């Protein structure tokens, strides 16, 4: 038996097993600190209901904090189909204040971004569970929803944001709430008579440490290294059916940056990267007499139907140099997804990366944009000459074309990611660099 | 003869499996006490 | 590990009697047929 | 072994150490698809594992479902029950191991 | 196996093909008269089958297995029944009810 | 190449079986001997010769040593052929061993019988079977000289030639008992046979002529042989039965270092029967036909080897009241135990209990000493004697544990013991070594 | 009469012409170790000489030893030093209608029973020699 | 209870077998041995093969010792089962061993076939008759490979391993006769088959290449082999009468301490007929049925143990007119002699007389040295030969005195002696120690 | 083992002594000495008419 | 574990000492009331120490 493979041996295993350093079969375990992780409920400052501001001020029950999950509780304004991810819709955005100072900022469309990227799998599919309605619900529904947030320390321990060395200086998460919601208190541009208001509950996951590690966190100076979201809204260079659109857009980011994403869409319909079609999920109706190329299946909203988005191809340029030769659309939506992430990025969302691993918390290559004078994104969009209500004219078409709805694609959104250094000492904290 | 021996198809000489006791030696005991009582423990000791 | 022979070759020529016979030590007389008979004396007799 | 019963087995020492551990089983089916669930997890109603005449630990075919429902996942989940169940739409008297 | 260690293996095969080649005469027929039914049994006769092994300590005393130097080593004979036999359970493709 | 593509195959494996060589096969070595030759002489007999007549011989002291004898009988069919078995074996009753006036050892017919059906083998048993049958077809008034050599311990082997010339005072006689009876010669089952004729009997044996300094020192050394003796007593069986498994335990009166116990159940009044009568070939007179009755032997196909025709269903030796091996069923008995200890096969109803390696062989190989066991006994559980015996069918589709109904007529049994002693001889004179 | 069902309780048999071996050698390192014997060669001789058995058709056996049958080695063919090892089979015509039974009797040294092409597993079997090491109450084959 | 208690029973009756122990049976150590290969080498034949032909064969030097010999023939059958008797073994007529251009010894097809009726057995003479006849009912028109192999001194063990390695300047050679006419092969009785194949031949020998050390020592050292001879001479047989009893002395021109005589008596027309034709079923050709004839053996059913076909019905051998040994009867020859020296079957008509208690061996065990003896005379008494072998019932029930009719063809006496000589090799060359 | 006569059904005993049904104190369980003594019982299913 | 075969056990080393020794069987009735008789101890034909 094995003992066969065990003589089967010579000058060429010596490599991989002469002097052997390391074996399988046991695991030392490395001794850790003694902590315990507690869910403590903030207070809701403000008032929470559709399109209002609200705040929370991160209470000092704990030494250290990590995850925040924002709960919501929402009714469904219509039946199964009409919603996409509400809960993440409703978070319009969220913003990180640290003594005063903006450490980050969130946005909707970054939450769906983001998922879009770096989630997958069933992390994905239990992610969706959180904000949205999956088993064919029907109106008056109601659900709580948790929306995790992803600032740099509710990713990971290794960056627990430690309140107990912040004994000056408060955290804060300020909070907008969308104005309105699809499939929710409205239907497209319709209100829905009736909907509710929004419940909503902020959850902030707080480690207590003990003795000795409490003590060096409150005494000890920290260096935490994180990642920061830089986000600007432009105006698309809108595609059209009878030409190529193009775009080039000096980006106004700064700091190492680990990688660019972006998206085009629909500002009408959250999550709407791609155009509407009569192809099965791409419209409400598609695939029947009923079929609307004017508004999206939204429970289907996202597609990997590349047919559909509007990025011919794309390049980056830094103070007049090409950074990479142009490459396709497809090539940021399913390469370097594949390269660098391992998920499935859906149609009309891309990713370029400056980073080996950018979904990961090491560094592993930056773009220093706090170096460079002319960073911008060129963009070319595709011809929008297919009829969109003949799935024929869609499906059979070729790699130069998209929809004639994907012109209602007017917003653009670009994002960037970056490391910065959270510098904490003597109870307050601030970033190094601006 | 003209072909060496390659050294293809070895042995391993004296290879002795893992030791099996027949004896069936009797199981360790353990270390920790039983959790007896958390605050009650060791009696009370009532007084007339 | 079996045990010892309580009884042995002894008990080939036992005594019927109760009366200890008188002991005869078995000491090769004839130098033909040896008789491995053992001798079967009363340990402690009725006296 | 068969239906309801106890059985063991002790661990032969061929080799030096050991690690997985696999049961297998040969069922058949007494219905049609979708009559059948996880049925050879269900069969495995509990394993013990004792260490010299002492408890070590055990499992229960609940905790093999619980187990599965928390700590695998994507294909590593449809993997596993693929070994455990008929999954291709397999009719009354399959036979699979 | 010795101590976990296979040391031999044999077939059914094996047994008929040694025979063949290495019993003989008497030897040989008492052989058959031990693994078969030689006087014209039938249907439903029954009869103890003796088959002998072969392994080298099978074979003479020379060879016997010290079990009393392997206090440590336990030695152990794996078997495999046929799934068939036949005139027995089958015969040739039919199974005998 | 050929066979020194071999010879280079040369490594570590090899050191166990060619280093450092200790012998070679292509060159042998033949051992010096002493002078001698072997000649047959006639004795002469003291006493008249015919059925169930008793008488001697005394080995005059022709040559040195003496090993084999070998009986001759003349006798003439008293009917065709099928209707004798082992005729001059069956005639031969018994034969004493005596040296000195110490009876030495003593064969019986039916021990030549058991003896050949666990110990003689292939063609040496067929050619033993010539010697002492008809067996090609022969019919009545055919005459034939039959052979029966003896089975003593000097017989076996010139190792144990009996020093005659070193037992200068003693005498050696030989005591042959005649058979009152003998199946197809002088008796039909029952029923004499009008006009048999008696045996012509003579006795010969082979004697060793020595060399001039190999004589002289085996007739003035004292000389130790280690001989083998048989023990043996009739009796009657726990009669086995259509109604239930009869059972029997045999206090074994034996003494000595044991090398084997064998044993047979046997119709009495058939020589050779060792199983059942039944109408299945061979089985019975008659077996095959309308006319097969089983109350009758098919005599020159008395022994058999189908076992349904046995009645020993299991069997153990007890020893002091404990168990000497597991109980084991009759048929280990008749084909394992043969199969390990001696190489060749056993008819049905025949049984054998080694506590030897060897016991086929002379040297020593392991021994149940009964001068040290205050209570040896032979444990048998017998068969169900269920089956009706006029039907093949029933027969031959039966199960292990039941037999015919004739089987109830294998009402005797025959336990046999065969030991060690020790032959002593000094001074001219001999006796066995160990009484008991 | 049923060529494709043996007679179960006669399935092996001592006629040669339903044997289907027709000539074998055995090659050592690219050279041959004997020259070509017929399959009979295999079957009756090896054993007379080595055996002095009876080797029923259709079992065949080759001897590197004098007394393969004892316990006394008596010459090996150590395989662990030979880098090539094969063993060359002609098999026999099967063109004998085995329904037919003279065409099997009175047949030639080439040819065997049309029946014979159902016999298509082959079984080879070799018997070697090695040490078992026991001290200090463990033990195992010097020669894994 | 079990193993145990037989160890614990021990007594003074042990002390001969196991008290201060010289063996043990369980650990067998094995002898270390000098490394070699066998190879089976194709030999050519000088002169082509038929019958009747003489050809030769010279042992190449390709190993260095060497044993074993078989001779290949390929036959046909001229005629269906039965016609044919070891046709293979009548082929090979003769073979001459010759050494340096001197005869060491000499075989015959005869002698074949006298051998295997004495010394081989069992298992063995089948597989032997399966390599020298058709034993399966082959029938006219078929073809095999029939196998012969030799039994000289060399030819029987590795022990004897005749070393062409230390006869550097002597060749060896084999030369073989080839049978004018073999039986159901080219011959019907006396009629030619038309058609008829010659036989294919090869001779194979067996070689053994030994390690440098062992080669060495053969290639320069001296050697002396203990070895047999076979003596023979064919002569005219005191052909029985049916009007009295035929009787001969025949003058033994043998020479050499002698193993043993054997003798048949024959029918030269029939190869292997050692007895008279008879129709009882097996001894002669359609034996038992309408067509019978006892002109014509039943070829394939030659041999037989049917003493009453046999001619022999006493012998001695006389030394120097000296009585050997009393007179014995033919059946004692037959029957008794080869139970006690070989252990194997003689059929009738084949008879040996041993002067070694093992001549079936290697080893020396007594032997009669005819070199010491003038007068070596075989002393025969024939049966009357009066039974009409036409009517079974005349001979099935005959007396021991008497055969058939047809027994007076059995005019061919072959009377053979086995001996030991000694070959030695030296410097190269050798031949045997002793001229006669 | 314990007591030597007849218990009815319905009726259990596990002793922890080796003879509960006497005076002796042979071996006993303390119970101020262990933290959650627990009784698990499993039921027949009561299915029968 | 069946009718007429033959099964055993080696007692583990879980205590130090041992005493009671309790066979447990199932057995299903082949017939009414009245016609068995202590079946548990007929079917355990015997047991070595």
Known sequence: ?434 | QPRGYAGLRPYEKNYEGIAEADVSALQARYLDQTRGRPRTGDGDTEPI | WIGVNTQGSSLKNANYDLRADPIIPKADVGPWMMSSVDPNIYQKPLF
């Open chain 1, 1 to 434: 038996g094995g003992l066969s493979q065990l003589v089967a041996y010579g000058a060429q295993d010596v490599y991989l097993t002469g002097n052997p350093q390391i074996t399988f079969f046991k695991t030392v375990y490395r001794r850790y600190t003694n902590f315990a992780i507690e869910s403590i409920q903030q207070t809701i400052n403000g008032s929470v209901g559709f399109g209002n501001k609200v705040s929370t001020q991160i209470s000092r029950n704990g030494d250290l904090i990590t995850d925040i999950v924002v709960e919501f509780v929402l009714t469904k304004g219509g039946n199964g189909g009409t919603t996409y991810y509400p809960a993440e819709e409703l978070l319009q955005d969220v913003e990180l204040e640290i003594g005063g100072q903006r450490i980050d900022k969130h946005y909707n469309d970054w939450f769906r971004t983001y998922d879009a990227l770096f989630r997958m799998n069933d992390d994905r599919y239990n992610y969706r569970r959180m904000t949205d309605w999956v088993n064919n619900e029907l109106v008056g529904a109601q659900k709580r929803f948790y929306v995790p947030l992803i600032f740099f320390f509710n990713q990971t321990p290794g960056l627990a944001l430690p309140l107990i060395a912040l004994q000056y200086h408060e955290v804060k998460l300020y909070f907008t709430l969308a104005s309105q919601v699809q499939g929710v208190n409205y239907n497209g541009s319709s209100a829905i008579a009736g909907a509710a208001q929004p419940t909503m509950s902020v959850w902030v996951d707080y480690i207590f440490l003990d003795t000795q590690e409490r003590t060096r966190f409150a005494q000890l100076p920290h260096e935490y290294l994180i990642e920061q979201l830089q986000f600007t809204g432009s105006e698309t260079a809108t595609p059209s059916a009878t030409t190529q659109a193009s775009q080039n857009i000096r980006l106004n980011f700064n700091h190492p940056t680990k990688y660019l994403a972006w998206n085009f869409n629909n500002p009408t319909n959250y999550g709407q990267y791609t155009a509407l079609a009569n192809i099965p999920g791409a419209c409400s109706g598609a695939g029947t007499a009923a079929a609307t190329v004017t508004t999206p299946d939204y429970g289907n909203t996202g597609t990997y139907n590349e047919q559909l988005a509007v990025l011919d191809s794309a390049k980056i340029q830094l103070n007049g140099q090409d950074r990479f030769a142009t490459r396709k659309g497809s090539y940021f939506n399913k390469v370097q997804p594949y390269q660098s992430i391992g998920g499935v990025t859906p149609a009309g969302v891309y990713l370029y990366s400056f980073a080996l691993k950018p979904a990961g918390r090491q560094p592993s290559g930056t773009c220093n944009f706090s170096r460079i004078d002319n960073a911008t994104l060129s963009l070319t969009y595709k011809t929008c000459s297919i009829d969109a209500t003949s799935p024929a004219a869609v499906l059979g078409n070729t790699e130069t074309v998209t929809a004639n709805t994907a012109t209602l694609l007017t917003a653009l959104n670009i994002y960037a990611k970056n490391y910065n250094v959270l510098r904490i000492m003597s109870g307050m904290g601030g970033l190094a660099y601006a």
